[PDB]
Design a protein around this ligand. Structure first.
Ligand SMILES: [Ca+2]
Ligand SMILES: [Ca+2]
Ligand SMILES: [Ca+2]
Lengths: 303, 311
């Protein structure tokens, strides 16, 4: 068959030029799961302009300067993480794909995480002053605890280990932003910024698929490895997650300093750390007490 | 100001870690052209399943096996070029961006060229047999003239010269597929496969912007260079275009062998070669005779993409 004696262009470009290139074949596909994911993420296309964030103005005006600062800072920090994933992380997955369709799906992911980053700008334009916006950018650049998180993960994207790169690509949508996502749901549970929470739910509708898919592809690759190499990768995952949780806790304590929200946000974050691990085929070590989310906040998350 | 003492993440990842990272700022935009392009390409989002080509079945079934084969082969060849650009070319532009928004726009481009590639499969699903689809894939793999074209561009994407990479990224949507796009417009001008041409026009509505945008960013960067380096880059562009035209001519004569379409297709290609040069800030050397397109074909080429097909 033509497929078994040719390579996809990205394999030609970065791995092996010994055989000629094949065009993508969407009429005969290797993995049915790729078509399912492709259809879902493309049919879920959205842009921030179609949520009426202006209707949040009354409840925004109920919040003082400190709360408004917290929200702008929180969201600008999430914007940084999306900028990392759109511009580096998801595109780095393309060349390490198992299938042709997967290469196209990661292109979609990079674009949609771009749209996620863009959506915070829409919220800021609708609600924040230009000085609130600028202050939050200054704060993000100068917050070492914030910066430590992407600085720890970026090297996996730029190094030559596809499995470690894949783990980072799952960890970003699966875990790293949930500490910040706590804030809008905490607020909307109390009748504040309901339209902003609709944008957050559109973002999560994508991110849950991004985490699942990267975890799915990770599991396919690692299952081929020897038991010793499988154990080595598991050890790497739990060690990296442990480090990222340490960094996330430090950052969230700084972010929410004065508001009391950090310990709840950390539990919300750890619930998702467990989900991240589950999507890689591992068991969550975290207790029900460690991952406890208030019913009113969980209702916002799961709507 | 925070912006002037920080770097974007992709700059941090690949080039410069002397400063901390900044989040993309969509509230204070460096180049309003980026916002204009972002808004247009995102508003133009479409998916090929929304343009069913089941209504092409009557005119498709009129065509003999040779014409059906030609179309399947031509489109599978265009699918390869889209696969090259989606999986390698456009994403390679992200790290060489002048602005933050440009990084996100090239992510959009890579995705949408993926959609372009996807669209041919939806056409084949409706019109082609399993055997026709498989034969075309075999033919593309084994056709050296076809292969030579993306093989000439890929090295620029994987190498570390950003301007040469940018030129390649402009040449793909600006020039390399038009020799093949001649076929559906030749057909639809004769009342054949009209719905397929709607898909081609949706594809072109994106590709014209991809070419414009890469050409625009190229011009901004080369304007900063010394006159000597500008002269070096101009010579590279015309040299690369000359090479690509030679490779395209050889491929189109093989593709259209027995149909007589190759000389018209080559003129159609060279018209777009001129536009490619113009979008890079250079003058087209090609004569009116060399780039002559029939009005009935140009009518199909230039018709507005149907807004009803938008997502
Ligand atoms: Ca405003
Ligand atoms: Ca508390
Ligand atoms: Ca002729």
């Amino acid at each position: 068959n033509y497929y078994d004696r040719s390579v996809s262009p990205v394999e030609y470009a970065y791995f092996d030029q010994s055989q000629n290139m094949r065009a993508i074949n969407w009429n005969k596909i290797v993995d049915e799961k790729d078509l399912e994911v492709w259809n879902r993420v493309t049919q879920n296309f959205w842009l921030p302009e179609n949520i009426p964030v202006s209707n949040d103005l009354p409840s925004w005006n109920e919040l003082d300067d400190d709360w408004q600062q917290l929200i702008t800072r929180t969201f600008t920090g999430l914007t940084l993480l999306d900028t990392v994933q759109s511009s580096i992380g998801d595109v780095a997955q393309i060349k390490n794909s198992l299938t042709e369709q997967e290469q196209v799906i990661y292109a979609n992911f990079a674009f949609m995480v771009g749209v996620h980053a863009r959506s915070y700008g829409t919220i800021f334009s609708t609600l924040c002053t230009s000085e609130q916006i600028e202050e939050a950018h200054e704060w993000v650049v100068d917050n070492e605890a914030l910066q430590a998180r992407p600085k720890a993960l970026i090297p996996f994207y730029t190094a030559d280990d596809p499995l470690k790169s894949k783990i980072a690509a799952a960890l970003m949508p699966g875990f790293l932003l949930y500490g910040g996502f706590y804030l809008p749901f905490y607020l909307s549970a109390r009748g504040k910024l309901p339209n902003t929470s609709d944008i957050i739910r559109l973002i999560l509708r994508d991110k849950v698929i991004h985490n699942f898919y990267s975890g799915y592809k990770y599991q396919l690759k690692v299952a081929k490895l020897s038991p010793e190499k499988q154990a080595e990768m598991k050890q790497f995952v739990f060690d990296l997650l442990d480090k990222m949780i340490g960094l996330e806790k430090t950052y969230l304590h700084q972010l929410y300093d004065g508001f009391g929200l950090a310990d709840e946000a950390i539990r919300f974050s750890l619930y998702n750390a467990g989900k991240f691990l589950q999507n890689l085929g591992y068991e969550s070590p975290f207790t029900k007490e460690e991952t406890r989310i208030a019913p009113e906040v969980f209702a916002q998350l799961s709507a």
